[model samples]
Target: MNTVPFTSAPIEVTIGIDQYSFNVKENQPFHGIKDIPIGHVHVIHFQHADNSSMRYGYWFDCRMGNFYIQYDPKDGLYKMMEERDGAKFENIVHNFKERQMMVSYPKIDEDDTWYNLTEFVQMDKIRKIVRKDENQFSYVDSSMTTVQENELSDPAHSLNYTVINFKSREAIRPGHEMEDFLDKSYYLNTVMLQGIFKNSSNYFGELQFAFLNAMFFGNYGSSLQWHAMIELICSSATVPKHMLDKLDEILYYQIKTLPEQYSDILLNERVWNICLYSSFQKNSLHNTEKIMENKYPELL
Candidate 1:
């Protein structure tokens, strides 16, 4: 498959909690959940030096862990790619078939690049080309009245985000009941996600209600939340490291404090350290030569 370069800013990518979000409108092919917008579809928009602008999409259902990638050539996205620059693809035929098909690639490589780019852009204080609106968003439970925008979108303003997980000490398998697994726990994430649907709106005047629902109930831990998103992006296309770096440098001023209290902290305190940087450093020096040379068959 050919590697496509990005041309635009603030490319939106959403990690879908469900395999299929209810369609809000049939007008657009990638539309879902009218009240809570943005994160339901993964959007990638870019322009080339040749002035070819493309908007590609990949649907990620977190529950089923399925990734649906777009391949419609009408949007400048080709379902097939034989090569990129000088690198010959190991297998291009696998990445193409019907228009907007799904295929496999080296997912780990793509994730490393993605994590590296996003981290670099945010850490280095580069120009702003990416933003996640869902992090700042919340909808009412009963009437479905959107409380609207807040102090986000500013460099000085601290973005509001809550860390969600199951209240249990260990990751509990909800049960063999497939209905709850398919519906609420997997797709909806009803407890931590605020509601089962758009109209599940409830009163916001009570602090305890939001606190209870938002904090202590969900399908995954912070670790799962972190990796699942990276995996979704990896399933579609691999972003060249150079492209990510170049775009951030050209476009973006740059891309958090904490609080404490009763139930649980919004931040996952046990992790999120310089360990990530160290991890990158370790990976950068990965030596295949040593691995092959030090083969131990007897130990096996």
Candidate 2:
């Protein structure tokens, strides 16, 4: 029996209903992609001062920036779109002359588009037939379900070409081994926090305190609305210096508590650049810079 409590003690705050309790924690960080444990689900739960309550489940895989927010348990476990049958039609093309299908897998791409396509084609039976109009033809599977249909047209009149551009992978920087790892860690933690507050918004009511509390921690996810919120908070000067100091303190604790294997790695310039560029924005700028200057001067 793993005795570790899955959450931190509830932090209480008042909005309109006098008081409320909020608790957030990672039940467990993902260990591996192929073997996600279904038994250990991430949770965020809170209660009203009057004992009214709200709870939610969140799953985040930061390595690929993939996440799922579960508003209701009755909706069932979250399943990736790729996990469904017929999920990889994106990479398939028809060769009418040869009566064959071609699955074009992009080289060096990180996504499993090609893998899904290959699996789908291999597992499912497909057949092709011409429609009443001889120029029109369709592809059907074992169930006689149409997958796609096309009408023959003159090559000169048809727009048969598609232009696609893949984003080049980022060049690995020398001596920044921890940069990517920490980047994903911070991103997952931050979004998990955000999902907790956002899902509990109804119970917390109209007050913006939940969002304010979220800023007390660090974040690296990309969202224009989130950045705008941070900008608004900073521009208004509503948060006091002491509050910002506490923000820095909590962020420091977050970084410090990371797994021992990552303990030796310090925050690098690229990680900071990405964090500031994404959602941290103006709020953590000064504190983050100060931390770098004081603790990680070599990185600066």
Candidate 3:
């Protein structure tokens, strides 16, 4: 199947009251929806009406929760990211393998380095990589250049990007789900990304890379939307103190994305404060070190 560009996706999903209350867990895989602890957390469940259901089997029908959108990439607890420089991967997002995840601290850009996790997955098949500086892009850097100055030629020509083939390098699984120990839960996310170029054509041209999947938190009383993205990725990561500095710099993107989605007093009241910093840098110091310290229990 060809990749769908971003613009082609429906601009907004219909918002409605949540149907169920759900609790979050550390290792929930995407589509494992039966886990929603009814009466705990309410959610909106929605699914894609066509295609690909055949490829997934019983797994496709899993209940993600009430009112949740089926096939949305961002619904997963973990997000996938890839490299800035190296070999190009083809349709890497379709791979159905599952593995734990962590977001990179390095901001995406030309200077950002790639860290490979091929050693983690037993299959020795495709590995994972996250954009170190992709989101930490500085606009009007201390050097006095616009964010455009560091642009790295994403196929989408987005100003905020610096990582190359980020999505192609890492495959992101959907978030929190109910597995065997719990009753049946079903529902998945739909990710329909598209591009508008070559005179309004809806498919990609350069095929550089795509974001693969992403989710919006709806300002869950959490510190900034981007911070939530960071934490969701961080709980399982081994981020060093130095790298966290860079993550703070990229907070701009998280801020910008909000206005595009919300407005007025409601959005204002939903905003939270920064309770921590210092250790909030960018990129991982070392993959092995990360898993050892942050993911110790999982390692055992």
Candidate 4:
């Protein structure tokens, strides 16, 4: 309970149909540095005027730069607010605790998104926070153990290949750590650390390929789109070019097989809409389109 400059009453801000409000009591300021001891601050409980929901907004100061905020449930979701004039810029965090932790910054303009499908730039949203994991698959070393492939055929024989046993690990649900853990794993296996890289001659490449293979070839389940969506937004040079090229192919059809109400065209519209609102300087969009065209011209 720290003092804020406001009149001790809450304030309201509106966007589209969503209205957000917070009070002075909710405007808390955590202590600052030893010398300063009065700077860190956060405002919690930005409620909907209609009593539907609420969220927290954090800040370094009262009215300085943008205000950092987080979802109430600690879902590894957070965002920032930009309201200089009456214009509002809001980007939400998605699939963060899981695979690609992307900060989706929406493009304020139209028809000006993704200058080229090949440029890897922030579109409507999905900023990739670079991983700073400890060292050499530190977390992956345990999470992904080496699986013996056809051991009977190579008994007492020397092998130079790598195989990994990715556990059933599925903690993407709320109140679970899977999302956060996998986030760490993305950096550990997806990026090059030490000898590990996507498609390297090591277990790292094998792990990435294995996950995609499972998603493609795995039995019917929600995991299909889960992994597909993960790699879709993910940026990795090690992932095979085919996987990168297969986003529209794989994701499109994956959703295509859903109930009749969920058509592939609808899926395309949804994804493309994100593209329209996004400042897409980057993504494997061109590659995906090229490959999809090569395989199924009718779909396009």
- Candidates in order, TM-scores: namely 0.17, 0.21, 0.19, 0.21
Weakest lDDT window of 10 consecutive positions for candidate 1:
250-259
Instruction: Write down the lDDT that model 1 would get.
Output: 0.24
State residue 49's C-alpha deviation in candidate 1, in Å.
4.7
Which tens-of-lDDT digit does each residue in 5-100 have in candidate 2? 111112331111011123222332211112221222211122323323222112122222222222123542221221122222212211211332
**Which 10 successive residues of model 4 have the least lDDT summed?**
135-144
- The residue-by-residue lDDT of candidate 3 on 1-300, one tens digit each, is 111111112312222112212332322333222232222112132222232121110001112211212333454211222223222222222231132121112223452111110011111110111222332211111111112333423322222321222122122324433231121111101111111121101111111111011222221221222233333223323333443343333332223233333433213221121112112222332332333233222212
Please list the residue runs of candidate 3 whose C-alpha ends up more than 4 Å from where it truly belongs after superposition.
Answer: 4-241, 260-300
Worst 10-residue lDDT window, candidate 3: 117-126
Q: Please list the C-alpha lDDT of all candidates, in the order they appear.
A: 0.24, 0.25, 0.22, 0.28
Over 4 Å off, model 1:
1-49, 52-56, 59-71, 74-300
Model 1 Cα lDDT, one tens digit per residue, 44-78: 22222232222222222122222223334455432
Off by over 4 Å in 4: 1-228, 231-240, 255-259, 263-283, 286-300
Q: After superposition, how far is residue 256 of candidate 2 from its true place, in Å?
A: 3.0
* TM-score, structure 3 vs. true: 0.19
lDDT of 4 at 235: 28
Better of 2 and 3 by TM-score: 2
Please report how far candidate 2 places residue 189 from its true position, in Å. Answer: 25
